[PDB]
Design goal:
part of a larger assembly, 5 chains, alpha+beta, three-stranded antiparallel sheet, elongated, binds a molecule of 4 linked components (NAG-NAG-BMA-MAN), binds a molecule of 3 linked components (NAG-NAG-BMA), binds a molecule of 2 linked components (NAG-NAG), binds 2-acetamido-2-deoxy-beta-D-glucopyranose, viral protein, membrane fusion, glycoprotein, receptor binding
């Protein structure tokens, strides 16, 4: 069975690259800045510093993850004036020049579907517990500049983008070069650029419908949010636990008890709350490494996919990968993969070799295919009945040594 | 209603017991401190960085002498730069744009230029251009 | 309590048996696009060609190739029957739990 | 040196994809059916 | 109880590591043909089961 026709469609791929980096002051968490707190707390020696170093090391990774993933392009390119190349319409993927948002329309659809603790917005505020969330090194605007200078680069320079300096080429030129890489002749490209453009522009509007009408494609981004929510909420909720004292309030234990026992119960209050943080440090230390595993996916799915050609199956989506376009998102990367999908199959009949002039005639590539009227060489990706010559076949040995041949002629 | 609590369980607002004014109760202040340095082999001045705090309440309580820790030899130097991460004290905000040397937060990034410690806005990369036509490789 | 998994033992090998039954007839297009009928030596001649030996070598030698891995399949059945330490990494998953 | 003959062979590998999934009744593990345990369990909160 | 849950979250991060490498070899080396050296058996890969 060999397919005839084909239909390019585009598959979305979603993965997280960073998590919300935090920090904790211990004194404003452990007690609430009381003197009776700080008295007993210094007989443990240094324990806040070990918690300061771990939450810093988590906080360094989140920038380092997003830096490696995005900043692989060292030449920021001006987004081209024409955004309509060869009949293909990149206008919803490049940043649109009208609005001062410097985002695509599609990236705007990505923020609107996934969008306590002290944080400053430059309106600053601060909470009683010592919890705080710090802002990253790389703002949201700079990421969208890297995405824009990456889509603009391969809308112009093609596969040459990552070989060094990005080298200018026509768009339909390199689109044919990616058709060689999937084992399809580029006649299919050049002779069909109208309806390939009709399909390519159709699919991007179809994904646009999807991200507006339905949801849950970016649940892998919300999941990063929901684990920051629960770990910070559960850390709060163990303030009101007593750990065996008369109260969760340090001042009630202070007031109504003698220093023979008020010392003892707030000493329980301390080590009860040191282990609540030491819990919180560890579970933040684990899933930092689960994000760092998903970070080096997105680092390799941007080099080996967007800057080159994918050869591995279902890597960069189902079907024959052609090219792929990154988009940003809050704490994540949303990919768009341009895929080649064959269709319209026909039942034909094969022969491994043909017997002619008493000799053994092998196909040089592909197979000899007999449709019921004539023999010809064509490939399995696509039907194209190339007439058997002396050139597209080759000779080794004589007839009737390999098994199951067809007696035939070679021009 | 006596007083108010937040979305969490701490008290954040109170009706005044004599005159019924609805005050807000905020924390007093705190935060972390970074020290930014080019190294002992280059300099011995640094710019400290008071994280996640309004620069109004920073600069006052240093003049009004209410920080713990307290430094023996230390001056504001009239260089306090409000940024997203905090209140940078000691580095001159240049309005230039270089590659990032030492990270701070939200595109602000310290460095050491001709010499003193400078802070600025991070550059992403070189703005190149690729001319485009349909017939040229 | 140890909970029972969602995919039982029967449905696991039902995927695997359907998977090998696919690629005995469908070829390398079984993963790329749809499963497409192809005679089996045609798949082998292709996969010879993809590793840098032209399909001269299959067609001239369709029985030496048939004899060799039909031997080598049964040697695994000898080595799985008699000896050990070839499935240790599956048992150490069971031991560490 | 150029090889002239060849030999095909099957080699095996094995990878775990799963492990045993468990669950723990926190109530019955710590207390073990004493209610006076369970009264002092509640002041430790929703740790279970 | 808290210690046991931590030493399960590590090992479930070990399984999640290698189950991604099993879903990759099954995608590449079974449903396709690999060209990656000393990956999916040794020698020149033909097909796999
Ligand atoms: C490339 O693809 C893009 C896809 O975004 C496409 O550009 C878009 O085209 C639509 C219509 O073709 C534009 O929508 C218009 O926007 C203007 C902005 O002011 C509106 O005023 C218009 O609304 C009026 O007309 C509608 C017609 O029915 C009415 O329904 C409506 O109520 C108003 O009367 C109109 O909708 C859209 O702005 C552009 N987007 C961009 C970024 O240009 C473009 O056509 C494609 N190009 C090619 C060459 O194929
Ligand atoms: C750090 O703390 C200082 C105070 O110590 C704080 O300064 C204050 O900020 C608020 C805003 O957060 C200012 O309020 C507004 O400022 C503008 C700018 O001049 C005024 O025009 C405003 O007046 C109009 O707007 C109101 C609401 O929009 C109207 O209700 C009102 O009737 C007016 O029409 C308004 O005053 C405030 O002025 C300053 N005060 C001082 C002394 O600076 C600063 O914002 C904090 N910084 C950080 C980073 O948190
Ligand atoms: C490349 O390697 C392959 C395998 O290593 C090799 O194929 C082998 O070829 C030889 C000769 O054609 C085969 O050996 C014969 O096998 C038959 C079938 O069992 C036996 O009956 C033969 O026995 C005769 O010879 C013996 C030794 O002299 C006598 O003791 C006996 O009584 C018989 O007279 C003989 O063993 C061998 O079986 C194959 N191997 C396979 C797997 O088929 C091939 O020849 C090599 N290439 C080159 C160019 O040599
Ligand atoms: C190969 O596949 C493509 C698409 O998969 C085929 O193109 C489509 O062909 C159909 C007819 O089979 C066209 O439908 C017609 O459309 C016009 C205008 O919309 C309408 O007036 C007709 O009534 C009918 O609906 C369709 O437009 C066309 N698509 C495009 C983008 O051109 C193509 O025909 C296939 N090749 C062969 C040889 O059949
Ligand atoms: C089988 O393929 C051959 C070509 O390989 C087809 O023969 C051609 O038929 C068209 C129209 O019928 C003619 O214009 C050409 O001159 C023929 N060329 C040759 C070389 O024969 C044949 O039609 C195909 N059969 C079927 C059923 O599609
Ligand atoms: C407590 O006493 C003060 C003054 O003694 C009250 O303040 C007066 O409040 C009324 C309305 O509540 C105003 O009309 C008067 O103008 C206020 N007095 C002055 C001198 O300005 C206050 O209301 C009292 N508290 C309560 C709860 O009633
Ligand atoms: C501090 O930096 C200075 C450079 O200004 C270093 O001094 C020079 O080091 C190089 C090699 O490291 C030698 O070739 C020169 O002869 C050195 N010059 C002098 C005047 O010593 C110095 O070693 C550095 N010190 C540290 C501790 O980093
Ligand atoms: C080759 O084409 C490139 C297309 O950009 C030309 O590059 C620019 O040319 C302008 C003036 O012609 C210069 O100001 C720019 O600095 C060039 N940019 C780059 C990246 O080279 C280039 O001039 C052409 N070269 C020749 C020999 O025709
Ligand atoms: C490709 O772009 C070139 C511009 O460099 C177009 O070539 C010009 O076309 C106009 C009319 O279409 C002529 O008057 C000019 O003399 C052409 N100049 C050159 C340098 O070729 C060309 O039309 C574009 N291709 C297509 C298919 O429109
Ligand atoms: C044609 O191919 C389809 C799909 O493989 C198959 O179902 C059908 O039976 C085939 N027809 C013939 C005549 O072989
Ligand atoms: C194909 O199989 C049929 C039986 O199904 C057999 O008669 C025929 O000889 C076979 N042909 C080849 C080339 O193996
Ligand atoms: C092909 O036909 C010729 C007669 O024209 C015959 O001599 C030859 O043996 C045939 N070959 C095969 C493989 O049947």
């Amino acid at each position: 069975a060999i397919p005839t026709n084909f239909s390019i469609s585009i598959t979305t791929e979603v993965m997280p690259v960073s998590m919300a980096k935090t920090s904790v002051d211990c004194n404003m968490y452990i007690c609430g800045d009381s003197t009776e707190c700080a008295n007993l707390l210094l007989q443990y020696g240094s324990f806040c510093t070990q918690l300061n170093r771990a939450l810093s090391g988590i906080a360094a990774e989140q920038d380092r993850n997003t830096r490696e993933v995005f900043a692989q392009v060292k030449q920021m390119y001006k987004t081209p004036t024409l955004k309509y190349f060869g009949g293909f319409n990149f206008s919803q993927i490049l940043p649109d020049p009208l609005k001062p948002t410097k985002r695509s329309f599609i990236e705007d659809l990505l923020f609107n579907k996934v969008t306590q603790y002290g944080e400053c917005l430059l309106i600053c505020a601060q909470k009683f517990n010592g919890l705080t969330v710090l802002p990253p090194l790389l703002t949201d605007d700079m990421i969208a500049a890297y995405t824009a200078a990456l889509v603009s680069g391969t809308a112009t320079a093609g596969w040459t983008f990552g070989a060094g300096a990005a080298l200018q080429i026509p768009f339909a030129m390199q689109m044919a070069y990616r058709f060689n890489g999937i084992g399809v002749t580029q006649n299919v490209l050049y002779e069909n650029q109208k309806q390939i453009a009709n399909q390519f522009n159709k699919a991007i509007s179809q994904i646009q419908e999807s991200l507006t009408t339905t949801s849950t494609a970016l649940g892998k981004l919300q999941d990063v949010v929901n684990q920051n929510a629960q770990a910070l909420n559960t850390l709060v909720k163990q303030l009101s636990s007593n750990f065996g004292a008369i109260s969760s309030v340090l001042n009630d234990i202070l007031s109504r008890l003698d220093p023979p026992e008020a010392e003892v119960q707030i000493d329980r209050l301390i080590t009860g709350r040191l282990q609540s943080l030491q819990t919180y440090v560890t579970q933040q230390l684990i899933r930092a490494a689960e994000i760092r595993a998903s970070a080096n996916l997105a680092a390799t799915k941007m080099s080996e996919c967007v800057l080159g050609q994918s050869k591995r199956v279902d890597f960069c989506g189902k079907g024959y990968h052609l090219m792929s376009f990154p988009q940003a998102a809050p704490h994540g990367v949303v990919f768009l993969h341009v895929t080649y999908v064959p269709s319209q199959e026909r039942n034909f009949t094969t022969a491994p070799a043909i017997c002619h002039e008493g000799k053994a005639y092998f196909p040089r590539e592909g197979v000899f295919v007999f449709n019921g009227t004539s023999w010809f060489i064509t490939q399995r990706n696509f039907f194209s009945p190339q007439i058997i010559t002396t050139d597209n076949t080759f000779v080794s040995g004589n007839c009737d040594v390999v098994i199951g041949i067809i007696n035939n002629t070679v021009y | 209603q006596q007083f108010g609590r937040d979305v969490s369980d701490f008290t954040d607002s109170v009706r005044d017991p004599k005159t019924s004014e609805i005050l807000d109760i905020s924390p007093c202040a705190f935060g972390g401190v970074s020290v930014i340095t080019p190294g002992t082999n280059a300099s011995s001045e640094v710019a400290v960085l008071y994280q996640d705090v309004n620069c109004t309440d920073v600069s006052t309580a240093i003049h009004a002498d209410q920080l713990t820790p307290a430094w023996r030899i230390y001056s504001t130097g009239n260089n306090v730069f409000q940024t997203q991460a905090g209140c940078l004290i000691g580095a001159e905000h240049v309005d230039t744009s270089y590659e990032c040397d030492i990270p701070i937060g939200a595109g602000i990034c310290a460095s050491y230029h001709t010499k003193s410690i400078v802070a600025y806005t991070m550059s992403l990369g070189a703005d190149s251009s690729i001319a485009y036509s349909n017939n040229t490789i």
